[PDB]
Amino acid sequence: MKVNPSVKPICDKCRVIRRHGRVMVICSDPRHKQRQG
Amino acid sequence: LIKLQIQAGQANPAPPVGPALGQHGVNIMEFCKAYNAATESQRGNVIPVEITVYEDRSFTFALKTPPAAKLLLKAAGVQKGSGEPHKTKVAKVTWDQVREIAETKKADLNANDIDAAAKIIAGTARSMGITVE
Amino acid sequence: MAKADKATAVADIAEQFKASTATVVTEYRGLTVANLAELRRALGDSATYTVAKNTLVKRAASEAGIEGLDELFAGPTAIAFVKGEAVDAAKAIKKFAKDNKALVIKGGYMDGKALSVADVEKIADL
Amino acid sequence: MLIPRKVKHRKQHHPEQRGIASGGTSVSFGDYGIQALEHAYITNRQIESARIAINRHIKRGGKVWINIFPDRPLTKKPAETRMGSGKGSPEWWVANVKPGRVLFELSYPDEKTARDALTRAIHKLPIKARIVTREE
Amino acid sequence: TANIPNKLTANVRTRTGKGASRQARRDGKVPAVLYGHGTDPQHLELNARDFAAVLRSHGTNAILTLDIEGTEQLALTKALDVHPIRRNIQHADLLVVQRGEKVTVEVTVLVEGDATPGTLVTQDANTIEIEAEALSIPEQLTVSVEGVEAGTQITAGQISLPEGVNLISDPELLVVNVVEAPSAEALEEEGA
Amino acid sequence: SRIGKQPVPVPSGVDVTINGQNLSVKGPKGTLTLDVAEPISVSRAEDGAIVVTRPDDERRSRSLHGLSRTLIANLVTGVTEGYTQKMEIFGVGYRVQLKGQNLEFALGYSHPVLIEAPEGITFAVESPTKFSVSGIDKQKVGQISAVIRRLRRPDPYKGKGVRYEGEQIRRKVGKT
RNA sequence: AUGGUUUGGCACCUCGAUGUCGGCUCGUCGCAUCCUGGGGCUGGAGCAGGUCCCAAGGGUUGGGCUGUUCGCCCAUUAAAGC
RNA sequence: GUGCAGUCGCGAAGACAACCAGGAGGUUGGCUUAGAAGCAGCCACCCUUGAAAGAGUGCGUAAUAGCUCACUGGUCAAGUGA
């Protein structure tokens, strides 16, 4: 879970959502998974 | 159902024989030697070949005509390819020989007529930097 | 799928129905590009087999003389015209339909009069 | 590196950061430009970084204009010295940049790559900025 | 050249000053000026949305058939007064026009270009000075660049015109320069 | 929206008690509960369906309408048929059996692991490496199934652990 | 951009006195965590790890040289915190 | 993330999504190849049956294969992307 204030949809399948007041990037590739914080 | 470009009177370079099709369990000898026989009866070019495998390793061998660029390499005088297509234009090629090639690529390709075959092959020439004048 | 291009498609539909003798729509489900290549390399001499848009035919169908076929827009519109003989067409569609065992024929229509499955088999025979 | 070959007066006051642009509020020589929004002093090294950012993002061919030149110096004075006793020497050179002013102009065909390049060059600078087309 | 001169309701101004003008811009109008050989400088307020539709449609130089005080009038847009940041339209000068007049004009070119691979274009200029008729100003001087090679300096006295239109910028100009295209190693030696 | 406006089919012996907002559905498998909030109305479509209705088209309503519809759909669907997930134990010397209601695993630990059946679900083993989880409350079913799934820390090298029947897991190689 | 511990900038209270480096004893506080505890990714096979998140409850050695803080070394340690 | 005012692109000729099927032959374009086959990279980036097919967008293979997408019609149906 790369924690960074900059997250992006790296690949074509990274979807950007918002849980509980935190931005997240969910993807089938766990290298890509990340969030603000 | 796997396809390759194999040299005419030769056999057993590892990458063009082993990894793509020599792993799947169709044996080296019978295919390669019947194909050497047939391909030296052709003795024409590096003939491409495709293999249809059925449910019991039954392999059927289909031969083709050699590539368009190689046909140009042998016919049109383009002995080496131009690293800058459309900028160094060292080929002036004749619609005559391109039309014999068009007859060949009609008996091979989706060609509509000899004209459309000539246009197709000239288009590959356009892409690889071969100016059919 | 721009509008005047859909008008062009309408023109194609009418200009082939009225410029051909036989006309039957069929179906394709279980058929691919290479099979179409076999077909249109073999019987492309005089046959006319293509595919078109149902929702486009919904507006194209009142420009030609097909005023009796305003109910058969359920199923993909795979058009079969021929310009010459009338028994070659449906029998040839049967040839290829058994060559693949995927091509269905919807119905029968030749010079206005509606014809069913067994009628189309009789059309093969004659 | 960008510097002048000689200035008459090599110790100048600090430029002003008051007012909006009068010129350079219009793309001139390319197609895709950069426009500032704030007041800031932009130096030599920043502009070098930015032009390199652009040339490593188009990489082949497509031209880049720099409508700015650092022709106004600033004076650091050496370290751990009590205030007073003169005015330090020029060490780095700025250009003032008032809002509305245009810095860079690209000429590359595809807008995708061009807009991306200008963005990479924006993130090498201290100012909020935006991207411009020559159109109205 | 079958132009439809756009129509616009304009009303003369009560107050002429900075406060009034800002209040007008705020409300959603744009002040404007009208003059020429009318020799009676009128001060108007147009409506900005309508004005922008007119411009976006028919280019910047675009004749107008105004409606002043119930009476109608004919005008041309000579000059605009734009803001840099917001890119509003702060003020607009308007030259009265009778039909059949020769007034000088400055329009924009359009590089319709697809070149050889080893080619790049450079637009040294956008704006060319012209005299034409009133109702017959163009919108886009289309210049085509296709099939051409490296250096081909498109001069200004090479563009195709209407019939009855004259070039008045000097024919020395480089409207375009077709450069020999750069190297990735030439891009290191430009501005360092 | 496109889901929240649809009416919901309702077969024969399917008794739906609309006690205001509180809803409760009886069928041969049980009598399930459901509740909803004050805003949205639960009208019974008197063709033999149920339909949701909302006053506003605001954020909350647009959100909550469709939810309620999908829930009641699952509800009646379960009480007709049910739900039954299938799970499959890939591994070496791994195994599953049953002890009455409660289920027993062998997953390489030094002690075996068991699970307490909750009230509303039952286990069903078809082979030592293959079983199911049959229930009605889809929440509960997938809950317990995933709890099982998370026992073994995943291992994408050799393919050990538990798998949902159609789970196409990822894989790598440690060649050396 | 932080933090305000470092070398410094200003000189605002204290020069009719605010006793200054280090050590000892004695604490107590922060977490930007050395170990223990939970965890996500791996160019993580396994043992060992690398980096990141949460986390302060407890613990966080004795010795040689130097007045020395800092440091280096020896022998151990779950660990030898800022 | 919302609420407001714009302008733009597409929509009962059926928008966007979804789901069935296609997703082609020149061709393993040229160079560089160890391998460079649609996919470290450099240049060109046209042509044809077709209803649609990019010198191919991503992932995967040392190279291939392969999962795929971009472009097309099908079953249902009002709005949807900048």
mmCIF file of C-alpha atoms in Angstrom, chain E:
data_model
loop_
_atom_site.group_PDB
_atom_site.id
_atom_site.type_symbol
_atom_site.label_atom_id
_atom_site.label_comp_id
_atom_site.label_asym_id
_atom_site.label_seq_id
_atom_site.Cartn_x
_atom_site.Cartn_y
_atom_site.Cartn_z
ATOM 1 C CA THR E 1 -19.908 34.867 -49.922
ATOM 2 C CA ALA E 2 -23.473 34.768 -48.604
ATOM 3 C CA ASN E 3 -22.936 36.217 -45.144
ATOM 4 C CA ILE E 4 -25.728 36.567 -42.574
ATOM 5 C CA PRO E 5 -24.790 39.758 -40.656
ATOM 6 C CA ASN E 6 -25.698 38.930 -37.089
ATOM 7 C CA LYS E 7 -28.337 41.026 -35.370
ATOM 8 C CA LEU E 8 -27.949 42.582 -31.941
ATOM 9 C CA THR E 9 -30.000 44.740 -29.603
ATOM 10 C CA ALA E 10 -27.917 47.642 -28.309
ATOM 11 C CA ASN E 11 -29.059 50.511 -26.132
ATOM 12 C CA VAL E 12 -27.322 53.815 -25.626
ATOM 13 C CA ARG E 13 -25.688 54.470 -22.281
ATOM 14 C CA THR E 14 -26.747 56.781 -19.513
ATOM 15 C CA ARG E 15 -23.447 56.886 -17.619
ATOM 16 C CA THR E 16 -19.997 56.756 -19.184
ATOM 17 C CA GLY E 17 -17.251 55.967 -16.695
ATOM 18 C CA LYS E 18 -15.362 53.262 -14.880
ATOM 19 C CA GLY E 19 -17.922 52.576 -12.160
ATOM 20 C CA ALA E 20 -20.785 52.283 -14.611
ATOM 21 C CA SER E 21 -18.702 50.121 -16.917
ATOM 22 C CA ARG E 22 -17.754 47.678 -14.188
ATOM 23 C CA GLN E 23 -21.351 47.474 -13.029
ATOM 24 C CA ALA E 24 -22.295 46.728 -16.627
ATOM 25 C CA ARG E 25 -19.708 43.976 -17.066
ATOM 26 C CA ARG E 26 -20.891 42.573 -13.751
ATOM 27 C CA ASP E 27 -24.562 42.605 -14.721
ATOM 28 C CA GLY E 28 -23.580 40.750 -17.898
ATOM 29 C CA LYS E 29 -23.269 43.363 -20.620
ATOM 30 C CA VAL E 30 -20.232 44.703 -22.423
ATOM 31 C CA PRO E 31 -19.744 48.399 -23.195
ATOM 32 C CA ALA E 32 -18.982 49.318 -26.747
ATOM 33 C CA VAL E 33 -18.218 52.201 -29.031
ATOM 34 C CA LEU E 34 -19.488 53.043 -32.496
ATOM 35 C CA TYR E 35 -17.945 55.523 -34.906
ATOM 36 C CA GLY E 36 -16.490 55.948 -38.372
ATOM 37 C CA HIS E 37 -17.592 58.424 -40.979
ATOM 38 C CA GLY E 38 -20.766 58.612 -38.926
ATOM 39 C CA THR E 39 -19.055 61.399 -37.006
ATOM 40 C CA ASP E 40 -21.340 60.942 -34.001
ATOM 41 C CA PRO E 41 -19.564 58.594 -31.569
ATOM 42 C CA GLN E 42 -22.178 56.411 -29.949
ATOM 43 C CA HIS E 43 -21.741 54.572 -26.677
ATOM 44 C CA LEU E 44 -23.576 51.278 -26.322
ATOM 45 C CA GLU E 45 -24.029 48.228 -24.144
ATOM 46 C CA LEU E 46 -24.145 44.863 -25.863
ATOM 47 C CA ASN E 47 -24.884 41.514 -24.222
ATOM 48 C CA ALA E 48 -21.812 39.376 -23.782
ATOM 49 C CA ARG E 49 -23.269 35.928 -24.434
ATOM 50 C CA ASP E 50 -24.828 37.059 -27.703
ATOM 51 C CA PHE E 51 -21.648 38.865 -28.696
ATOM 52 C CA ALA E 52 -19.532 35.805 -27.974
ATOM 53 C CA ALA E 53 -21.850 33.596 -29.987
ATOM 54 C CA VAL E 54 -21.435 36.027 -32.870
ATOM 55 C CA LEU E 55 -17.648 36.021 -32.660
ATOM 56 C CA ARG E 56 -17.188 32.289 -32.081
ATOM 57 C CA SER E 57 -19.431 31.759 -35.085
ATOM 58 C CA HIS E 58 -18.162 34.134 -37.744
ATOM 59 C CA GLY E 59 -14.623 34.946 -36.675
ATOM 60 C CA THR E 60 -13.538 38.170 -35.017
ATOM 61 C CA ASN E 61 -13.870 40.571 -37.921
ATOM 62 C CA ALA E 62 -17.562 40.002 -38.527
ATOM 63 C CA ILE E 63 -20.076 42.545 -39.787
ATOM 64 C CA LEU E 64 -23.092 43.390 -37.615
ATOM 65 C CA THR E 65 -26.629 44.632 -38.222
ATOM 66 C CA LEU E 66 -27.291 46.442 -34.971
ATOM 67 C CA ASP E 67 -30.539 47.724 -33.457
ATOM 68 C CA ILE E 68 -29.994 51.087 -31.756
ATOM 69 C CA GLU E 69 -32.918 52.877 -30.141
ATOM 70 C CA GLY E 70 -35.331 50.908 -32.332
ATOM 71 C CA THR E 71 -33.482 52.177 -35.377
ATOM 72 C CA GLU E 72 -31.097 49.724 -37.024
ATOM 73 C CA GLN E 73 -27.531 50.356 -38.105
ATOM 74 C CA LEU E 74 -24.626 48.587 -39.797
ATOM 75 C CA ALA E 75 -21.219 48.130 -38.198
ATOM 76 C CA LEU E 76 -17.963 46.234 -38.368
ATOM 77 C CA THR E 77 -15.801 45.064 -35.490
ATOM 78 C CA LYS E 78 -12.500 46.918 -35.809
ATOM 79 C CA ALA E 79 -10.916 46.235 -32.432
ATOM 80 C CA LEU E 80 -11.369 44.221 -29.249
ATOM 81 C CA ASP E 81 -10.217 44.881 -25.695
ATOM 82 C CA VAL E 82 -9.531 41.608 -23.928
ATOM 83 C CA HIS E 83 -8.359 40.721 -20.438
ATOM 84 C CA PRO E 84 -5.293 38.466 -20.177
ATOM 85 C CA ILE E 85 -6.216 36.152 -17.332
ATOM 86 C CA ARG E 86 -9.984 35.902 -17.396
ATOM 87 C CA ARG E 87 -10.155 36.319 -21.174
ATOM 88 C CA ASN E 88 -13.415 38.223 -21.012
ATOM 89 C CA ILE E 89 -14.254 40.920 -23.545
ATOM 90 C CA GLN E 90 -13.916 44.280 -21.807
ATOM 91 C CA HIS E 91 -14.715 46.673 -24.666
ATOM 92 C CA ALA E 92 -15.384 46.685 -28.394
ATOM 93 C CA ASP E 93 -14.846 49.292 -31.078
ATOM 94 C CA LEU E 94 -17.244 49.256 -34.000
ATOM 95 C CA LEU E 95 -16.756 50.923 -37.354
ATOM 96 C CA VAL E 96 -19.926 51.989 -39.151
ATOM 97 C CA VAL E 97 -20.212 50.621 -42.659
ATOM 98 C CA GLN E 98 -22.143 51.496 -45.753
ATOM 99 C CA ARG E 99 -22.328 48.740 -48.330
ATOM 100 C CA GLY E 100 -19.776 48.874 -51.123
ATOM 101 C CA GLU E 101 -16.922 50.417 -49.096
ATOM 102 C CA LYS E 102 -13.201 49.605 -49.090
ATOM 103 C CA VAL E 103 -11.987 49.273 -45.501
ATOM 104 C CA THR E 104 -8.745 47.607 -44.521
ATOM 105 C CA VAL E 105 -8.958 44.364 -42.597
ATOM 106 C CA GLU E 106 -6.664 41.935 -40.798
ATOM 107 C CA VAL E 107 -7.647 38.260 -40.856
ATOM 108 C CA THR E 108 -6.126 34.943 -39.861
ATOM 109 C CA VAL E 109 -4.542 32.170 -41.900
ATOM 110 C CA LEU E 110 -5.197 28.475 -41.504
ATOM 111 C CA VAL E 111 -2.404 25.969 -42.002
ATOM 112 C CA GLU E 112 -4.089 22.883 -43.424
ATOM 113 C CA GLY E 113 -0.924 20.810 -43.330
ATOM 114 C CA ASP E 114 0.184 17.227 -43.777
ATOM 115 C CA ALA E 115 3.830 17.076 -44.761
ATOM 116 C CA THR E 116 6.598 14.677 -45.681
ATOM 117 C CA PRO E 117 8.063 12.823 -42.673
ATOM 118 C CA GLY E 118 11.280 14.806 -42.641
ATOM 119 C CA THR E 119 9.449 18.088 -42.288
ATOM 120 C CA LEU E 120 8.299 20.590 -39.706
ATOM 121 C CA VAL E 121 6.297 23.786 -40.077
ATOM 122 C CA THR E 122 6.774 27.167 -38.426
ATOM 123 C CA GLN E 123 4.045 29.813 -38.481
ATOM 124 C CA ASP E 124 5.913 33.107 -38.369
ATOM 125 C CA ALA E 125 2.674 35.096 -38.631
ATOM 126 C CA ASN E 126 -1.043 34.723 -38.006
ATOM 127 C CA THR E 127 -2.452 38.033 -39.189
ATOM 128 C CA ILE E 128 -2.449 39.418 -42.732
ATOM 129 C CA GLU E 129 -3.707 42.843 -43.773
ATOM 130 C CA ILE E 130 -6.392 42.974 -46.476
ATOM 131 C CA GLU E 131 -8.768 45.292 -48.248
ATOM 132 C CA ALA E 132 -12.059 43.828 -49.357
ATOM 133 C CA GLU E 133 -15.706 44.771 -49.518
ATOM 134 C CA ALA E 134 -17.959 45.275 -46.525
ATOM 135 C CA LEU E 135 -20.081 42.113 -46.660
ATOM 136 C CA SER E 136 -17.278 40.004 -48.126
ATOM 137 C CA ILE E 137 -14.535 39.733 -45.519
ATOM 138 C CA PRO E 138 -13.310 36.144 -45.180
ATOM 139 C CA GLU E 139 -12.835 34.253 -41.946
ATOM 140 C CA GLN E 140 -9.922 31.930 -42.740
ATOM 141 C CA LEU E 141 -7.222 32.298 -45.353
ATOM 142 C CA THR E 142 -6.729 28.609 -45.984
ATOM 143 C CA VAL E 143 -3.138 27.800 -46.929
ATOM 144 C CA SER E 144 -2.376 24.199 -47.875
ATOM 145 C CA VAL E 145 0.991 22.494 -47.326
ATOM 146 C CA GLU E 146 1.084 18.959 -48.728
ATOM 147 C CA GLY E 147 3.564 17.199 -50.987
ATOM 148 C CA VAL E 148 6.120 19.955 -50.354
ATOM 149 C CA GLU E 149 9.571 19.220 -48.986
ATOM 150 C CA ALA E 150 12.172 20.966 -46.874
ATOM 151 C CA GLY E 151 12.698 24.558 -47.285
ATOM 152 C CA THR E 152 9.723 26.054 -49.087
ATOM 153 C CA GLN E 153 9.260 29.598 -47.828
ATOM 154 C CA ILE E 154 5.574 30.246 -48.353
ATOM 155 C CA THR E 155 5.614 33.925 -49.210
ATOM 156 C CA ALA E 156 2.552 36.095 -48.610
ATOM 157 C CA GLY E 157 2.117 36.793 -52.321
ATOM 158 C CA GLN E 158 1.283 33.118 -52.906
ATOM 159 C CA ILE E 159 -2.089 32.768 -51.159
ATOM 160 C CA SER E 160 -5.285 32.252 -53.157
ATOM 161 C CA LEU E 161 -7.890 34.983 -52.631
ATOM 162 C CA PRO E 162 -11.477 35.831 -53.471
ATOM 163 C CA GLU E 163 -12.280 37.898 -56.555
ATOM 164 C CA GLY E 164 -12.120 41.577 -55.665
ATOM 165 C CA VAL E 165 -9.834 41.232 -52.627
ATOM 166 C CA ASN E 166 -6.343 42.680 -52.379
ATOM 167 C CA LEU E 167 -3.218 41.982 -50.372
ATOM 168 C CA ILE E 168 -1.721 45.032 -48.681
ATOM 169 C CA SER E 169 0.803 43.537 -46.318
ATOM 170 C CA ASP E 170 4.045 43.475 -48.227
ATOM 171 C CA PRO E 171 4.716 40.325 -50.306
ATOM 172 C CA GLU E 172 8.065 39.880 -48.563
ATOM 173 C CA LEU E 173 6.578 38.068 -45.603
ATOM 174 C CA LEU E 174 7.298 34.576 -44.417
ATOM 175 C CA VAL E 175 3.856 33.378 -43.491
ATOM 176 C CA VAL E 176 5.299 29.887 -43.113
ATOM 177 C CA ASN E 177 8.776 28.455 -42.885
ATOM 178 C CA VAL E 178 9.242 24.771 -43.632
ATOM 179 C CA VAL E 179 12.294 23.944 -41.572
ATOM 180 C CA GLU E 180 14.570 21.026 -41.995
ATOM 181 C CA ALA E 181 13.328 19.075 -39.024
ATOM 182 C CA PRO E 182 15.357 19.018 -35.791
ATOM 183 C CA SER E 183 17.575 16.381 -34.302
ATOM 184 C CA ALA E 184 17.137 15.087 -30.780
ATOM 185 C CA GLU E 185 20.726 16.346 -30.405
ATOM 186 C CA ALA E 186 19.794 19.711 -31.918
ATOM 187 C CA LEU E 187 17.186 20.155 -29.186
ATOM 188 C CA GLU E 188 20.063 20.319 -26.672
ATOM 189 C CA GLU E 189 21.630 23.356 -28.382
ATOM 190 C CA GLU E 190 18.698 25.795 -28.498
ATOM 191 C CA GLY E 191 18.475 28.311 -25.658
ATOM 192 C CA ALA E 192 21.381 27.113 -23.519
#
